[PDB]
Amino acid sequence: INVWDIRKRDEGQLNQILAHRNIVTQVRFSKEDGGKKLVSCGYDNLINVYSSDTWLKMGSLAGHTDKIISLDISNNSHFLVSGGWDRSIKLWN
Amino acid sequence: NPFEILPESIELFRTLALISPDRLSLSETAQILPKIVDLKRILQQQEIDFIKLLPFFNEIIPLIKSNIKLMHNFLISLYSRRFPELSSLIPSPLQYSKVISILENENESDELFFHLENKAKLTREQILVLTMSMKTSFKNKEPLDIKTRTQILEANSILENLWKLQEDIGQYIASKISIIAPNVCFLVGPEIAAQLIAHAGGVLEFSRIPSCNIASIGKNKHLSHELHTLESGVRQEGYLFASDMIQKFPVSVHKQMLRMLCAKVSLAARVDAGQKNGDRNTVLAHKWKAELSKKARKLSEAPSISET
Amino acid sequence: APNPKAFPLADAALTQQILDVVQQAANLRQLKKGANEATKTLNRGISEFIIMAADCEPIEILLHLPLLCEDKNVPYVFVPSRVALGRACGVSRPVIAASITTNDASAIKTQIYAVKDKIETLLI
Amino acid sequence: FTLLNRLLRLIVDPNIADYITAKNNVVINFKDMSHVNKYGLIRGLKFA
Amino acid sequence: GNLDQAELLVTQALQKFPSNALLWVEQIKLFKHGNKSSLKKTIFQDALRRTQNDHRVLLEIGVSFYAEAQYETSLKWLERALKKCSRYGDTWVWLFRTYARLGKDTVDLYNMFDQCEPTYGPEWIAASKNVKMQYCTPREILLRLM
Amino acid sequence: NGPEITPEEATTIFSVMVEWLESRSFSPIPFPPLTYKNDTKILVLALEDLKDVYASKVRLNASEREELALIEEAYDNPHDTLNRIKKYLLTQRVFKP
Amino acid sequence: DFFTPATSELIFARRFLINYSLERSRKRLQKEMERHQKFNTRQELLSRRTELQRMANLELAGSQLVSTKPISAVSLSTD
């Protein structure tokens, strides 16, 4: 995940992140929280979470037997709703 | 009410289709024939909203096949040990049920003429071997139970009505195949295309069928006592072998025209499965039909004589 | 470009690797050529993955398969040239669709899982 | 072959009988002409 | 009841574990429902190639043919399952069901059963877990299973 | 025009044969077992009956050499030949011209 | 070609976009102004670690099968 800070154009633009074993499918932000929390999904079976500053892995989210092709975050950031080649929507509480 | 009646009906076909044969569940079984008549009237005069109805048939008709097959296996499960050769000699469940009702009619020459008229699908030789089994096997003793006689009469009724429903779907699809699968229609014919799609259910599924298995679709069940080998040498027979595209060319080429023909039918049905319902072009099946014509005329024309 | 419709389509390098696996499994008898035998492998479910051809015409006859591949959840790619594909399958006549099947005793199994993994990368 | 075949099903395992009639139904060939024998016994067979 | 995701999970579970028999058991059940029933005998052949004629797979063959009403074929497959593994009890259950429908004499089967003393299988273990059949003779266990 | 035999005639004559086999109490001939007692000797009789023609001519043609080759392979491998024979009796309904 | 099209329908909309993104740029950056003005390390870092701990403590809640093929698009509606 290439996190580009475009507020600084000539210095420290990119903060690179190592997301998933295989490629990255969808990336989302914590929305109403004012960002500061990111959530990413990819063809690795894990859905992982990040912060807007450290940009590090806080934890890995299991629950997908197979590829994770889509992800979306609740506006209030409480619950996560995703879908994948498992052909089933999933929640996180 | 079609959308109200139909899902519950398909659910019923799932229930009894899941019910194993030799376990009768007669009360639950008789509840199908009201839904059979219901689907007959929904099908016959409605002629409205086909586009929604096509996937519904693609769903139900395989369940209809497994269901009539189930009634067949349960029915022979009823006739077991009384006249066991009847399944081996009579392949079809329709011929099976009707001919059985005829053996249980009891009401000689009127019998030989009567199963020929009522069954109507029985060839002379089939009648011959059937009569052989009547002498060497059929017990001609009164049935074990009159309640068993009423049970098998009921099974005859539900199997007959169910087959009439399948044939009705075959006629309705037979009407709409022009817009359904235009390539297969132009390539073979409306009736035979309707029989292929009818036996294979969804056009998607008939595209999921390889070209090698299409030739045997519709083939009367292979029977070791019946003769097979023909001068054309074709062992598949079946629907497509009865098409004009084959039968117009000489006896030597029927085999190659059968293999090539089944291939082009598979490809054509795959194109029709890929195309939207609104925009369809027959040009592919057209140039393929031209190619098959070239193949048949080349295989028909022998090689020119060599200089001695 | 080899048609607007057909997707995904690999590059020259990955195409080279995939065709290498095509010839290899073809030497191990783990491959099934043709659209009909590809369909049979998909229905049986023993297919590791599906290769198809971009330059083939018409494209629809190869476009019936991707629906079946997405049904069985099996990966598939499009090599650009059917001539190169069948040439890799060991047939002079150009082949459109080939299928790498499953063998638990196969020595190339790891190669098939690697190439298959890159295919799943392409699928999207 | 139908009557004959049943009469053989009386004698032998119907596998053997169906083999017999299946062998009596073949493509008979002479020079540049070919047909099938549907009707009548083929004498050249050993079990004939 | 929806067998689509079941088929998917079977395919993936075979990709990870082709050798295990129980997966081919559940798949043979899926194709036993007959939503397709196009590829069937070839799926039995594949199950016998992968599982190498496992008694569970053979049993599932005899249960599928049991749902095809043919007690000669299903009886044959159940007997083959006996020869592979005797101590597996579901074989005996589906036996006494098939002999119950066809009508053959079961006495020798009771003899080989008392010689067998089978405890194995999901249905049999379930019988032991029903707590009413906890301590009782295997004969009346079978009687209550039928 | 179909088979000349009518179901009435077939009924009568087949009833005659069945009534005869029942009156004589004739046990039907079983398919040859996997292991049959006189099996090898029966195979010998067949092969010798086939070699009866070829013991004479000193000059064999191609087809005769193929047949005699088959027969010699039948002496060399009776188990493989007998199993090849039982396979055809159980299976093939389609034969070469 | 570079800068070739006129796009008449665009200019009327594009000026609505310079007004729109202009005012929401000033308003948004003003919210940022109040935020960076009023934060501090204590409830900033503690709340941050709290939320991150929550996400790290999330676990699969439920799942619902939908379609015969995989589910490509998953989007939560507003609220």
**Chains in contact with C via at least 3 Cβ–Cβ pairs below 8 Å:** A, B, E, G
CA–CA separation, C1 and C7 (whole Å): 12
Residue A13 to residues A9, A10, A16, C88: CA-CA distances in angstroms? 6, 7, 10, 46
Instruction: Flag if C36 and B270 touch (Cβ within 8 Å).
Output: no
CA–CA separation, B144 and B82 (whole Å): 9
Q: Looking at residue G57, what DSSP letter applies? A: T
- Same domain, yes or no, for B145 and B12? yes
Sorted by sequence, the CB contacts under 8 Å of residue G31 that are 6+ apart come out as none
Place of tokens 């080939």: C98
- Asked if residue B160 is part of any domain, the answer here is yes
Q: Looking at residue A42, what DSSP letter applies? A: E
CA–CA separation, B291 and C6 (whole Å): 26
Token duo for residue A82: 């995703």
- Residue B285: which of C66, C4, C56, C60 has the closest Cα? C60
Please indicate if any CB of chain B lies within 8 Å of the CB of C37: yes
Token duo for residue E44: 């039995």
Distance from CA of E8 to the nearest CA of G (A): 10
- Same domain, yes or no, for B186 and B268? yes
Tell me if the bond preceding C58 is cis, omega within 30° of 0: yes
**Cross-chain CB nearest to B227 (options D6, D35, D38):** D38
Resolved by? cryo-EM
Token duo for residue B29: 């079984």
Report phi then psi at B12, rounded to 5: -65, -45
Q: Strand A60-61 and strand A37-42: pairing?
A: unpaired
CA–CA separation, E124 and D40 (whole Å): 59
CB B58 within 8 A of CB B120: no
A83 strand-pairing partners: A70
CB C52 within 8 A of CB C67: no
> Could you give the 3-state DSSP secondary structure of residue A6?
coil
Q: In chain G, which residues have their Cβ closer than 8 Å to the Cβ of E4?
A: 68
**Chains in contact with B via at least 3 Cβ–Cβ pairs below 8 Å:** C, D, E, F
- Residue A69: which of A43, A48, A30, A38 has the closest Cα? A43
**How many whole angstroms from its chain centre is CA F32?**
11
Domain boundary among B129, B160, B180: B180
Count of C-beta atoms within a 10 Å radius of residue G74? 20
CA–CA separation, E95 and E102 (whole Å): 10
Helix residue ranges, H only, F1-97: 7-24, 39-51, 62-76, 78-90
CA–CA separation, E61 and E78 (whole Å): 8
- List strands edge to edge, sheet with A88-92: A70-73, A80-83, A88-92, G60-65
Q: Which residues of F72-87 are buried (b: 16+ CB within 10 A; e: fewer)?
A: eebeeebeebbeebbe
- Asked if residue B98 is part of any domain, the answer here is yes
Phi-psi region of C3 (alpha: psi -120 to 50; beta: other; left: phi over 0): left
CA–CA separation, F58 and C45 (whole Å): 60
CB B195 within 8 A of CB B216: no
Q: In chain A, which residues have their Cβ closer than 8 Å to the Cβ of G51?
A: 30, 33, 36-37, 77
CB C49 within 8 A of CB C70: no
- Residue F94: which of B259, B249, B258, B236 has the closest Cα? B236
Token duo for residue B19: 């019910």
- Same domain, yes or no, for B255 and B291? yes
- Residue E23: which of E34, E40, E10 has the closest Cα? E10
CA–CA separation, C124 and B8 (whole Å): 37
> Could you give the 3-state DSSP secondary structure of residue C124?
coil
CB C48 within 8 A of CB C102: yes
- Same domain, yes or no, for B175 and B274? no
- Same domain, yes or no, for B8 and B154? yes
CA–CA separation, B168 and B175 (whole Å): 11
Q: Where in chain D does DSSP place strands (E)?
A: 27-30, 33-36
Sorted by sequence, the CB contacts under 8 Å of residue B197 that are 6+ apart come out as B173, B177, B180, B181, B184, B203, B206, B269
Whether C contacts E, i.e. 3 or more CB pairs less than 8 A apart, is: yes
- Asked if residue B151 is part of any domain, the answer here is yes
Tell me if the bond preceding C8 is cis, omega within 30° of 0: yes
B73 strand-pairing partners: none
- Residue B76: which of B91, B58, B59, B66 has the closest Cα? B91
CB A29 within 8 A of CB G30: no
Token duo for residue B156: 């005859």
- Same domain, yes or no, for B68 and B171? yes
CA–CA separation, B184 and B181 (whole Å): 6
CA–CA separation, E40 and E34 (whole Å): 9
- Residue B34: which of B147, B152, B162, B156 has the closest Cα? B162
Instruction: Flag if B204 and C58 touch (Cβ within 8 Å).
Output: no
CA–CA separation, E127 and E92 (whole Å): 13
Tell me the angle at which helices E4-16 and C65-72 cross, rounded to the nearest 10 degrees: 80
Distance from CA of B239 to the nearest CA of F (A): 21
Q: Strand A37-42 and strand A24-29: pairing?
A: antiparallel
CA–CA separation, C82 and C56 (whole Å): 6
- Asked if residue B188 is part of any domain, the answer here is yes
Q: Name the residue range of residue B53's domain.
A: 2-83+139-180
Distance from CA of C49 to the nearest CA of E (A): 12
Domain boundary among B126, B148, B180: B180
Sorted by sequence, the CB contacts under 8 Å of residue B251 that are 6+ apart come out as B231, B232
Q: Looking at residue F30, what DSSP letter applies? A: P
Closest-CA residue of chain C to A20: C121
- Asked if residue B213 is part of any domain, the answer here is yes
CA–CA separation, F78 and C59 (whole Å): 55
Give CB contacts under 8 A, 24+ apart, made by E82-86: E82/E112, E84/E53, E84/E54, E84/E55, E84/E58, E85/E55, E85/E120, E86/E112, E86/E116, E86/E118
CATH number for C1-124 (one of 3.20.20.70, 3.30.1330.30, 3.10.105.10, 3.40.1280.10): it is 3.30.1330.30
Q: In chain G, which residues have their Cβ closer than 8 Å to the Cβ of A33?
A: 51
Q: Mapped to the 3 state alphabet, what secondary structure does chain B carry?
A: CHHHHHHHHHHHHHHHHHCCCCCCCHHHHCCHHHHHHHHHHHHHCCCCCHHHHHHHHHHHHHHHHHHHHHHHHHHHHHHCCCCCHHHHHCCCHHHHHHHHHHHCCCCCHHHHHHHHHHHCCCCHHHHHHHHHHHHHCCCCCCCCCHHHHHHHHHHHHHHHHHHHHHHHHHHHHHHHHHHHCHHHHHHCCHHHHHHHHHHHCCHHHHHHCCHHHHCCCCCCCCCCCCCCCCCCCCCCCHHHHCCHHHHCCCCCCHHHHHHHHHHHHHHHHHHHHHCCCCCCCCHHHHHHHHHHHHHHHHHHCCCCCCCC
CA–CA separation, G76 and A39 (whole Å): 15
Domain residue extents for chain C: 1-124
CA–CA separation, B71 and B241 (whole Å): 29
Count of domains for chain B: 3
Q: In chain F, which residues have their Cβ closer than 8 Å to the Cβ of B109?
A: 8
- Same domain, yes or no, for B205 and B101? no
* Cβ pairs C/E, distance under 8 A: 24
CA–CA separation, F64 and F62 (whole Å): 5
DSSP H or E segment with residue C48: strand C47-53
CA–CA separation, B187 and B10 (whole Å): 33
CA–CA separation, F80 and B129 (whole Å): 36
- Same domain, yes or no, for B32 and B171? yes
Please indicate if any CB of chain A lies within 8 Å of the CB of C120: yes
**How many whole angstroms from its chain centre is CA B3?**
27
CA–CA separation, B51 and B29 (whole Å): 30
Amino acid (one-letter) located at B15: T
Instruction: Flag if C121 and A43 touch (Cβ within 8 Å).
Output: yes
Distance from CA of F51 to the nearest CA of D (A): 14
Q: Which residues of A54-85 are buried (b: 16+ CB within 10 A; e: fewer)?
A: eeebbbebebbebbbbbbbbbeebeebbbbbb
- Asked if residue B308 is part of any domain, the answer here is no
Give CB contacts under 8 A, 24+ apart, made by A77-81: A77/A30, A77/A31, A77/A32, A77/A33, A77/A37, A77/G51, A79/G61, A80/A39, A80/A47, A80/G58, A81/G74, A81/G76
CA–CA separation, G73 and G76 (whole Å): 10
Q: Looking at residue A82, what DSSP letter applies? A: E
- Same domain, yes or no, for B145 and B157? yes
Amino acid (one-letter) located at D40: G
CA–CA separation, F82 and F36 (whole Å): 10
Q: Strand C76-79 and strand C47-53: pairing?
A: parallel
> Could you give the 3-state DSSP secondary structure of residue E55?
helix
Distance from CA of E135 to the nearest CA of B (A): 30
- Residue B261: which of B232, B219, B295 has the closest Cα? B295
Amino acid (one-letter) located at E7: E
Instruction: Flag if E8 and C73 touch (Cβ within 8 Å).
Output: yes
CA–CA separation, B48 and B52 (whole Å): 9
Report phi then psi at F76, rounded to 5: -65, -40
**Chains in contact with G via at least 3 Cβ–Cβ pairs below 8 Å:** A, C, E
Q: Looking at residue A83, what DSSP letter applies? A: E
CB B224 within 8 A of CB B85: no
- Asked if residue B307 is part of any domain, the answer here is no
Whether G contacts B, i.e. 3 or more CB pairs less than 8 A apart, is: no
- Same domain, yes or no, for B266 and B193? yes
- List strands edge to edge, sheet with C47-53: C31-32, C98-101, C47-53, C76-79
